[PDB]
Paper text:
SV2 family proteins belong to the major facilitator superfamily (MFS) with 12 predicted transmembrane helices. In addition to the transmembrane domain (TMD) core, a cytosolic N-terminal region and a large fourth luminal domain (LD4) are present.
The quality of the cryo-EM map is sufficient for modeling the SV2A and HCA2, except that the peripheral region of the HCA2 shows poor density. Additional masked local refinement improved the map quality covering HCA2 and SV2A LD4 (LD4A). Masked local refinement revealed the well-ordered densities of the N-glycans at the binding interface. The open edge of the β-strand from the β-hairpin of HCA2 forms backbone hydrogen bonding interactions with the open edge of the C-terminal β-strand from the β-helix structure of LD4A. In addition to the backbone–backbone interaction, the SV2A His578 side chain forms a salt bridge with the BoNT/A2 Glu1156 side chain. SV2A Phe576 contributes to the van der Waals interactions with Ser1142 and Val1144 of BoNT/A2. The protein–protein interaction between HCA2 and LD4A creates a relatively small binding interface with a buried surface area of 464 Å2. To enhance this interaction, N-glycans attached to LD4A contribute to binding. A N-glycan containing two N-acetylglucosamines (NAG)s and fucose (FUC) attached to Asn573 forms extensive contacts with HCA2.
Author numbering:
A (entry chain B): 876 to 1295
B (entry chain A): 480 to 587
Write the structure that this text describes.
Amino acid sequence: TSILSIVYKKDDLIDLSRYGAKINIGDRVYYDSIDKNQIKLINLESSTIEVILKNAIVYNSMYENFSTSFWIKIPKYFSKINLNNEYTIINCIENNSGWKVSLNYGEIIWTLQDNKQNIQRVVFKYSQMVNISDYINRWIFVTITNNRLTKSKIYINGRLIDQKPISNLGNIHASNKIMFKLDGCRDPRRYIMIKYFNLFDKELNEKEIKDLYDSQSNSGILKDFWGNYLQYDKPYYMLNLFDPNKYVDVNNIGIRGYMYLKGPRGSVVTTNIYLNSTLYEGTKFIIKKYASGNEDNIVRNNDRVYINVVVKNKEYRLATNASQAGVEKILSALEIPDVGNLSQVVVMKSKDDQGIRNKCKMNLQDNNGNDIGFIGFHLYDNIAKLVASNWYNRQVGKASRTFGCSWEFIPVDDGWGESS
Amino acid sequence: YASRTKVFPGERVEHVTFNFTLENQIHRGGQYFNDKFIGLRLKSVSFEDSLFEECYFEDVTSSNTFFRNCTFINTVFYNTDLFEYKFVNSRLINSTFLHNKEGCPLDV
Ligand SMILES: *[C@@H]1O[C@H](CO[C@@H]2O[C@@H](C)[C@@H](O)[C@@H](O)[C@@H]2O)[C@@H](O[C@@H]2O[C@H](CO)[C@@H](O)[C@H](O)[C@H]2NC(C)=O)[C@H](O)[C@H]1NC(C)=O
Ligand SMILES: *[C@@H]1O[C@H](CO)[C@@H](O)[C@H](O)[C@H]1NC(C)=O
Ligand SMILES: *[C@@H]1O[C@H](CO)[C@@H](O)[C@H](O)[C@H]1NC(C)=O
């Protein structure tokens, strides 16, 4: 049911569908080292991806429903130069007729234009004043459905954001060639990243789109704050979803010292452009592989690893005393050699028992393979102290809402621009 | 007290530190480039029409201190009680506030 499917291969891009669409690539198109199937397009002329379709599959009908899907990553807009600068990223418009996706300050837009130059637009709008954003500089699954008889709808991560009737529109033509380049952007240092572009000759429903989201989500591999692959030996800042205005901190080194959530988080501001909350606050959490036999530095589900802690640019270890009072017992950072037989083994957990994707959670386990439990926080005399407990596991068994067993890993990225 | 107020219209400053205490002053039209302000107390000091660029404010406590019509670029406010009501009609660009002191939301 797929007509175009741009997928990475041996130092090139090919089409999975049985149509053999011609592909040509510029000399300035880049690829991520770990996840090469994600494509970076910078604001230049040579940064071009041209895909040519077959005359038998060119959209030239008036009742033909069709859908598209892709993954997109849009860096932060830093200055006023980006305001009111609607710039195009994909065109299939010829003779002022076709379909185009474009980007504006906190906006992603679908545009359809028939032979009569009638314009229909569907928009997704995300703010940039928020404390922590789910969209800024993070991967977004954008899919777009077009039913010529009812409406045209936009889906962000599988959920409905906007819909607009298109019954008035007449015959919509499409270009034989489809476009990938930043077009109409005044900013010379603005890029995007794109991943998995798919086209379908029918209107997709909620079920099929959710299935596609889940399929392309790579639920069996851990993800960081920016939606990329989690890697070992890389320093990560830590965020708790349920308490996101505090950061992990230490007070004393060793067992007598406790790691806690200290706050509040600071701010980064640019008056009228962005007023986010600082993400580079606290103590880094390096991940060290223990038993994962995989050659890649990519972290997968159910992996058994160790976690280093960077305190005054020195690397310590997570461990807790298994034998102490209660279940919600305190974790600590200790000298690497002096761990002894303290519980240090952690299991990385992304998808649940049924395989439904959720955020990163770590399960402390002992040498005997007994679950100390999920890592989270609990308040002892007004201090939000880090604890590993099986209470989270109990609520998971009861299908209850666990509180604090969900963590988020934030590496330093150029798309955020914060000063460390 | 208001009669005794001192005024310094215009001053350009290059790389240098600034730990001191000022009382009843107005600095106007200042242009400070990459200047760090460590361990200073401000009592009724106002900066007007000033430009701070790659500045650094640390351990700053201020009473009746304002930054009006000021522009901050790539500046960092570390361990300061300079809350958002002390920047009157200012413009901050790529600026960070870290570890803000505890204080009242308004002037006391
Ligand atoms: C605001 O910052 C961003 C990011 O720059 C980083 O953060 C700054 C505070 C400072 O610490 C820099 O050294 C950091 O690199 C700027 O956007 C980037 O600017 C750099 C130029 O050094 C350029 O190489 C990148 O391509 C820019 N990225 C984008 C997407 O434009 C931005 O320019 C700063 N704002 C202003 C007004 O200059
Ligand atoms: C600040 O520095 C000056 C010299 O630059 C010095 O005279 C003064 O004593 C310093 N203040 C403190 C608190 O040390
Ligand atoms: C200070 O602001 C005034 C108006 O509020 C403006 O005319 C002036 O240019 C500003 N000063 C500088 C140095 O730009």
